[PDB]
Design a protein around this ligand. Structure first.
Ligand code: CLA
Ligand code: CLA
Ligand code: CLA
Ligand code: CLA
Ligand code: CLA
Ligand code: CLA
Ligand code: CLA
Ligand code: CLA
Ligand code: CLA
Ligand SMILES: CCCCCCCCCCCCCCCCCCCC(=O)O[C@H](COC(=O)CCCCCCCCCCCCCC)COP(=O)(O)OCCN
Lengths: 143, 80, 68, 41, 97, 165
């Protein structure tokens, strides 16, 4: 966005008991994802890693082992309460990377700031045959 | 990681991004369509290959294409 | 611009795009974009594809009059 | 009546009617011509 | 507190919906365009939770479907008793079972 | 006497099979009183078996080493040895009926594709039109070859959907 928010580990977690689909050994060895949002009131939601939790009125922080769980929680909060959350990725060494709102306006919008990458300027079906690209390491769709 | 390729037949309907369960696609400004939008894949290393973007594509054939290969921890959808 | 960039609106056209589902099929012109986009001709078909859609965008060179 | 007639005009109803007609024709042919194998008169 | 709550004549007994096969759902209300539609017509036929979001109409449909299944079961039982009455040797079996 | 097959009338194993079937039918028949419905049913079955065994004979049928009749297949060989009605004429009749069905279906498809929403006519049949085409298909081969002659039977490949190469 205008200024990228920084992850605060001291923000309170939502009211929830024990978890079984939560963090495995990958969290302490590889990266794990952390979703934060700002609940205006006390309400009950459903986590993608198990049953139901209650989010606190204020900042809420949750931890997941997969980015798909973070985006599932993000779209559940956006469709149900229009929450606009955001999740970071934390590596084993503590590096924090901002993932979902890269320009802060969500990928449904445009913002006229992003650069289109991995785009082919030809129509699909105009790609060359696999015989044309052989023993070269380049796929017909990568050119 | 998998390869996500987007062609000029896209109409900028933003349906592939909404159907994406891992935030791989994005919309960038463009001039080749009426909606002045074009799909991009700046986070293709997080794609698993679920082909949900291809299901939401309204154009004939596919304006977005997912090619599998070179599976990683993120591409295999592993929580461990 | 003089006349129009594409065919007459509402006229039947034949799709020459080989990768399209409606190759060698007849559709109806809904609208042709005058801005100058890559695929301005909007064609609607009576028979839907496997995705369930019935409208598509095509360029000028992949649409012709249906043979009789 | 015309709603009922269009209901009978649906594909499963006319299929059932055709199946009943064909089965009855073949069964009455086989009953009145017991065990036909060789086309002779 | 517990009492009979009944609405009088909510659905008209007409054959206008028998002509159109796909009528319970909005997806099949537009008519067929592919053959899978036919299968869909025979798949979501009794999925009353998908046709409407109102629990009262679903409960009424469940009640009437249960009545229809009971009528089917009673027809089958009457057919069993009729087959025992005419095309059977039950009286002969009673002498030496 | 073609293909090393004896005729059913002059065969030996054919008579053995006939006597065996009559013997088991009589063994089943002897367990009932003559004035009973199962007796009448078994007598009718025995009469039908005798009539079938008689009608399979005196018709050119051939059987080899087992009494079970064999069907001569090659036309010409079947034509010159009184076996045309075994398979040569039944396939002619089947071709007539199959062409009837195909021509009636083709006529219904063509006449139903003219109006708006042809899928509704496909899934809700026009019964008077179907019955009219049902009684108008008695001359299906003449009509089929004439549409072949005028080219309306075939569609040009430019108008037919073609899979990409
Ligand atoms: C009572 C329960 C019941 C049952 C068992 C069926 C069974 C069937 N219906 Mg359905 N149907 C029902 C209630 C039921 N229906 C109701 C309540 C409605 C709303 C009015 C419909 C409306 C409906 C439509 C609109 C259509 C069916 C069709 C079909 C068939 C599925 C497609 C098929 O066979 O492959 C495809 C089969 C073929 C391409 C073969 C075509 C030629 C066959 C040999 C002629 C049909 C003869 C038939 C099989 C025998 C009589 C039916 C049998 C149940 C006694 C199948 C025979 C479809 C159909 O007619 O297919 C036969 C179809 O289009 N049904
Ligand atoms: C649609 C096909 C079909 C056809 C062509 C026939 C034709 C016949 N049936 Mg039949 N029948 C049919 C279906 C059919 N049936 C069905 C579906 C049932 C079950 C309900 C019956 C039950 C039935 C009984 C119980 C009897 C017949 C009898 C007869 C004969 C006299 C009726 C008559 O004048 O018909 C028109 C014939 C034109 C040549 C005739 C050979 C009677 C018989 O044996 O005749 C002596 C008889 O007793 N049928
Ligand atoms: C696909 C393989 C096949 C073939 C070639 C046959 C062929 C035959 N089987 Mg077999 N059968 C089959 C599969 C097959 N069957 C299967 C799958 C089963 C298990 C269900 C059976 C079970 C079976 C039994 C149990 C018996 C046979 C019998 C027969 C004979 C029937 C002949 C007949 O009815 O007279 C000829 C009939 C006709 C020509 C019908 C007339 C139709 C034409 C179009 C005229 C239409 C009528 C009318 C004039 C139209 C105008 C009026 C209309 C507008 C209303 C024939 C040899 C019977 C037999 O005799 O064996 C030797 C027998 O006992 N089969
Ligand atoms: C108390 C009994 C009962 C009741 C009221 C229901 C009610 C329902 N079930 Mg359930 N179900 C039941 C028992 C029951 N089911 C049992 C015992 C099983 C285990 C097999 C299932 C498995 C089951 C599944 C897996 C699904 C349902 C679904 C459904 C819904 C729609 C069903 C439908 O439209 O079918 C329409 C009717 C048909 C499709 C016809 C079925 C015919 C079968 C497949 C073949 C017939 C076999 C026959 C005996 C042999 C024929 C031979 C041939 C030669 C004629 C509805 C809520 C579906 C749903 O969407 O739920 C929300 C769903 O996905 N049910
Ligand atoms: C459980 C249900 C059930 C089942 C499986 C059957 C099955 C049968 N019954 Mg039956 N029947 C039933 C209920 C049932 N019936 C009821 C409720 C009644 C009273 C109304 C009858 C009265 C009845 C009679 C009077 C006769 C049968 C006959 C038959 C046989 C042939 C029916 C047929 O093809 O008619 C085809 C009919 C039509 C196509 C149109 C009519 C078959 C074994 C017949 C039989 O077994 O012959 C010896 C027979 O004569 N049934
Ligand atoms: C392509 C399949 C095929 C095959 C393998 C046969 C095989 C045979 N035919 Mg046949 N034939 C066929 C189709 C076929 N026929 C067709 C479609 C017709 C037109 C109706 C004929 C008309 C025919 C005649 C007129 C004669 C044969 C005869 C023969 C036999 C010897 C042929 C020869 O060259 O000497 C042999 C059993 C001859 C025969 O009876 O052999 C003694 C004989 O006279 N065939
Ligand atoms: C009891 C008798 C019996 C039964 C039940 C069947 C059943 C069947 N036959 Mg068979 N057949 C039989 C006897 C029988 N046959 C006999 C005695 C012969 C002569 C030896 C044949 C010769 C025959 C052929 C040559 C073909 C069949 C086909 C078929 C199947 C589909 C028919 C169809 O599409 O609907 C009715 C037909 C239509 C809806 C479309 C019309 C298409 C027909 C076949 C064309 C007829 C006109 C054509 C120009 C004549 C030249 C034929 C060409 C092969 C040279 C069906 C399973 C067909 C099949 O299995 O295809 C996969 C097929 O091609 N049959
Ligand atoms: C009457 C319509 C009709 C006609 C003219 C044809 C004609 C043809 N079909 Mg098709 N077919 C049909 C219906 C029809 N089919 C249906 C309903 C099905 C779904 C079961 C198929 C499935 C089918 C397959 C899977 C294949 C063909 C093939 C063929 C070709 C071989 C000839 C043949 O008999 O195949 C045999 C055809 C069958 C066995 C299908 C019979 C299906 C039912 C029994 C007939 C339906 C009759 C219809 C209800 C009549 C409507 C009349 C109207 C007044 C209501 C030929 C171009 C073959 C091909 O490509 O050859 C080049 C092939 O592989 N067909
Ligand atoms: C699983 C896939 C699937 C399914 C569900 C169907 C289902 C159907 N197709 Mg289809 N089809 C398929 C695959 C399939 N097909 C394939 C692969 C092909 C090959 C490309 C075709 C080719 C095809 C053709 C060419 C036709 C169909 C037709 C039909 C219908 C047959 C029943 C009907 O309307 O006649 C009702 C069944 C009868 C037996 C009625 C016959 C009329 C009688 C004789 C009138 C007199 C009745 C009296 C009471 C006795 C039904 C909607 C037919 C259609 O739309 O209906 C006309 C048709 O013409 N199909
Ligand atoms: C073209 C086909 C020509 C066949 C000519 C048959 C001449 C001999 C003839 O009519 O005698 C038999 C009488 O069958 C009959 O019941 C008469 C069939 C009439 C055939 C011509 C129509 C027919 O041959 P068959 O009944 O002895 O043949 C074995 C069964 N397939």
């Amino acid at each position: 966005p205008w200024k990228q928010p920084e992850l605060d580990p001291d923000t309170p977690s939502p009211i929830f008991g024990g978890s079984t689909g939560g963090l495995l050994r990958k969290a302490q060895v590889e990266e794990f994802y952390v979703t934060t949002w700002e609940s205006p009131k006390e309400q009950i939601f459903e986590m993608p890693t198990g049953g139901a939790a209650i989010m606190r009125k204020g900042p809420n922080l949750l931890k997941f082992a997969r980015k798909e769980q973070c985006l599932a929680l993000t779209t559940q909060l956006r469709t149900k309460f229009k929450m606009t959350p955001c999740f970071y990725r934390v590596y084993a060494d503590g590096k924090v990377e901002y993932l979902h709102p890269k320009d802060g306006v969500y990928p449904e919008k445009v913002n006229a700031g992003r650069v289109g990458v991995n785009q082919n300027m030809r129509s699909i079906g105009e790609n060359v045959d696999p015989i044309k690209v052989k023993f070269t390491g380049s796929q017909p769709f990568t050119i | 990681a998998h390869v996500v390729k987007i062609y000029d037949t896209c109409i900028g309907c933003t349906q592939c991004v909404r159907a994406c369960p891992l935030d791989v696609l994005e919309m960038v400004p463009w001039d080749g369509c009426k909606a002045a939008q074009m799909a991009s894949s700046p986070r293709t290393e997080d794609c698993v290959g679920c082909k949900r973007c291809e299901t939401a594509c309204p154009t004939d054939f596919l304006s977005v294409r997912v090619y599998l290969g070179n599976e990683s921890t993120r591409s295999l959808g592993l929580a461990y | 611009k003089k006349k129009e960039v594409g065919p007459k609106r509402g006229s039947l056209v034949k799709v020459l795009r080989p990768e399209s589902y409606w190759y060698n099929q007849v559709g109806k012109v809904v609208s042709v974009d005058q801005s100058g986009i890559r695929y301005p001709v909007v064609v609607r078909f009576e028979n839907q594809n496997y995705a369930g859609v019935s409208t598509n965008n095509y360029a000028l060179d992949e649409v012709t009059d249906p043979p009789a | 009546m015309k709603d009922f007639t269009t209901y009978l005009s649906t594909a499963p109803v006319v299929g059932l009617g055709w199946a009943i007609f064909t089965s009855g024709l073949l069964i009455e042919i086989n009953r009145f011509f017991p065990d036909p194998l060789v086309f002779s008169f | 507190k517990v009492k009979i709550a009944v609405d009088r004549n909510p659905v008209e007994t007409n054959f206008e919906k028998w002509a159109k096969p796909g009528h319970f759902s909005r997806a099949l209300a537009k008519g067929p365009n592919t053959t899978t539609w036919i299968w869909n017509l025979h798949a979501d036929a009794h999925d009353f939770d998908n046709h409407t979001s109102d629990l009262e109409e679903i409960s009424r449909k469940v009640f009437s479907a249960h009545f229809g299944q009971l009528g089917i079961i009673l027809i089958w039982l009457s057919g069993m008793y009729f087959h025992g009455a005419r095309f059977s040797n039950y009286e002969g079996w009673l002498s030496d079972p | 006497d073609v293909a090393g097959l004896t005729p059913c009338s002059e065969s030996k194993a054919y008579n053995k099979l006939e006597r065996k079937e009559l013997k088991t039918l009589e063994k089943r028949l002897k367990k009932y009183e003559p004035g009973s419905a199962p007796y009448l049913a078994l007598q009718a079955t025995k009469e039908r078996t005798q009539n079938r065994f008689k009608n399979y004979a005196k018709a050119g049928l051939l059987c080899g080493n087992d009494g079970l009749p064999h069907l001569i297949s090659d036309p010409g060989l079947a034509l010159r040895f009184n076996h045309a009605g075994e398979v040569f004429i039944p396939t002619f009749g089947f071709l007539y009926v199959a062409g009837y069905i195909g021509h009636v279906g083709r006529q219904y498809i063509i006449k139903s594709k003219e109006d708006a929403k042809p899928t509704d006519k496909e899934i809700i049949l026009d019964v008077p039109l179907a019955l009219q085409l049902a009684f108008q298909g008695w001359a299906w081969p003449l009509a089929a070859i004439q549409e072949l002659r005028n080219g309306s039977l075939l569609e040009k490949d430019e108008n037919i959907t073609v899979s990409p190469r």
